[PDB]
Design a protein around this nucleic acid. Sequence first.
RNA 1: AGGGCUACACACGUGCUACAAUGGCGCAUACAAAGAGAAGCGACCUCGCGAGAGCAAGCGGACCUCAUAAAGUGCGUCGUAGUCCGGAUUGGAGUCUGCAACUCGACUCCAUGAAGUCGGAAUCGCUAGUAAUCGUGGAUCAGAAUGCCACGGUGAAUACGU
RNA 2: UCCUCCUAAAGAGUAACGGAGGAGCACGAAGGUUGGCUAAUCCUGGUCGGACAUCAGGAGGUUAGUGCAAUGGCAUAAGCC
Lengths: 177, 60, 115, 84
Amino acid sequence: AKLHDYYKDEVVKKLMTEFNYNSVMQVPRVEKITLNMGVGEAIADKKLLDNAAADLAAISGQKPLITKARKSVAGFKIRQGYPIGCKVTLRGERMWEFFERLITIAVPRIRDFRGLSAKSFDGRGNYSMGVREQIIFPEIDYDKVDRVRGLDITITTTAKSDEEGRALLAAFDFPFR
Amino acid sequence: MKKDIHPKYEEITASCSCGNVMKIRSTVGHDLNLDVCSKCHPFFTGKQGRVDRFNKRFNI
Amino acid sequence: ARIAGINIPDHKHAVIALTSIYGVGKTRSKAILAAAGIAEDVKISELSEGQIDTLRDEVAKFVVEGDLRREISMSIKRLMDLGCYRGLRHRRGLPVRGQRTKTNARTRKGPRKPI
Amino acid sequence: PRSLKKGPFIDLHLLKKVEKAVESGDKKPLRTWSRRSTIFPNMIGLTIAVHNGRQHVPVFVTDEMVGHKLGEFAPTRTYRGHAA
RNA sequence: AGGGCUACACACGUGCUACAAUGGCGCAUACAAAGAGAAGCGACCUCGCGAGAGCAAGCGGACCUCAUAAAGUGCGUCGUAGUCCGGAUUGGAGUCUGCAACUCGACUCCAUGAAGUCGGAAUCGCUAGUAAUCGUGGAUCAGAAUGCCACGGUGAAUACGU
RNA sequence: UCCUCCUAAAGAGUAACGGAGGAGCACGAAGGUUGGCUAAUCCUGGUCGGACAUCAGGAGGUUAGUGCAAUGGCAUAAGCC
Ligand SMILES: [Mg+2]
Ligand SMILES: [Mg+2]
Ligand SMILES: [Mg+2]
Ligand SMILES: [Mg+2]
Ligand SMILES: [Mg+2]
Ligand SMILES: [Mg+2]
Ligand SMILES: [Mg+2]
Ligand SMILES: [Mg+2]
Ligand SMILES: [Mg+2]
Ligand SMILES: [Mg+2]
Ligand SMILES: [Mg+2]
Ligand SMILES: [Mg+2]
Ligand SMILES: [Mg+2]
Ligand SMILES: [Mg+2]
Ligand SMILES: [Mg+2]
Ligand SMILES: [Mg+2]
Ligand SMILES: [Zn+2]
């Protein structure tokens, strides 16, 4: 809970000063981090989806939830209810630990990392970023890797706007370019 | 958390070359030997035309 | 095994393994290994962590991987924006060093496109 | 390319024309046939109309061009494609 | 004077280099023939990773120079991989000839590392110091050969027969 | 032969070789009950990923859904688990 204790001990005060909030409850919070793997290659091979789930479990520390097609789509040859991905919702202690591991270990291991886009906010202070290769997480062993897979990471926050979301993330020294 | 279905999640030590050590819970199982970390990566730290070269090569 | 942001082969000789890095050839591999005080035939997996760190330091003096790729793209785009002959050749996907195009030129033109 | 010890080649008539035009200000394009002359920093801002075999091609010299030859900016062959 | 003969959807001929282990790479070390050279061949030395550069002998030559022959042989490594095979393409930095290397030169260094894993139908050469393979030299020529002409090294298979 | 709507004149019923569509099943769960849940579509952000897969948020408010026509219903859902 290093980053949560840092949030409470420093980031709250910093944001209160920076935005002049009238109550401490008004400070943006990091609510949840969701990791998503869109596994379209599972349409023909189910071991692909199972291996994606194993990668996600290794990375996040949580057994993932297999997601299924909401509607049938000819364009991707998918019928309704077909499992085509996996996600994990990280909250609380697990979420702060993953935030720390991401920031301090995984992002530094991104090939040719020149800084995360600061425009990748959804308009309400929530940040999403892509990963192209799961090896950037040390939990994934390099010489056991079957297929190259990435994932999506979303950080949902209680920020009313993108500027407050970016300030909240920057307070953790998020690697914004 | 539901019992008996999640990966093993226990603390390890991440040792970087620059001498940074972080104690992080992980599913990796063993200790880590990082080649880089947030405290030493060039982008994190801050460590990251023709007339000039024409004059340098053709000094008169 | 992780140098310059990529995984080096572990079972190869070090002199061969380092050439996995975009921007290190054989001459640079030999020079890096001489300047890190490591024999050329030593496999990566017989190297210590101090040795791998010295190798990383030696690689640090060169422009490699993503930085080198950015440099190369910058030079090519500079040519292509200049509108010079070399830039136009780059634009058209044709040989840029005065080679014949009546025949051959297939590395640049790609496989034959029949009429 | 040309040996460094020999310096960069430029035709004397062109160098003189460029000096005159720089002194007098910014004249109309200087017509030259010296495709082989290097582009010097003191030509930046001038317009040099460079022969490509049949017509002079107006070259607006920028800083990126310095050290290149004038003929690199006046293509000599007309190609638009086969079967068009 | 500048441009073109060097264009490039494409078709064909003649070649070069390969696809590797009967090989690649590193170190060491053997054995040729033929030829050319005065606006030429240019040693030794010094500088440079190198192409080269500076200085400067000798030689109109069985004398001097071009001018380590290479394949080979020993030692070591790579261990069948698009690889330590291949070396096209492209970026950067250079050298030299030449008034001048943009179009459009050769060569060097660093980086890059494509196709190609032996080739459909068809088709060529070769009967012995031949084929195959390996280097070497010369003319043209300021510079510019994978072409041409010439020279040695290693060195086969097979011909029942009509 | 059977179902739905209109013709049909605000109860029911009402004809024509009038105007339009469907059925001749399906389901041991798609039945019973208890607990829970809430749609379409669009916008923004997000590895491959694209007009369209999965993820996050917003807008919207049933424009969805209903095993199969059409009508009448359906949120206390009759819709989803
Ligand atoms: Mg090289
Ligand atoms: Mg040519
Ligand atoms: Mg003429
Ligand atoms: Mg011709
Ligand atoms: Mg000669
Ligand atoms: Mg090779
Ligand atoms: Mg292939
Ligand atoms: Mg092979
Ligand atoms: Mg005969
Ligand atoms: Mg030969
Ligand atoms: Mg010659
Ligand atoms: Mg009635
Ligand atoms: Mg009535
Ligand atoms: Mg009646
Ligand atoms: Mg219910
Ligand atoms: Mg029911
Ligand atoms: Zn570090």
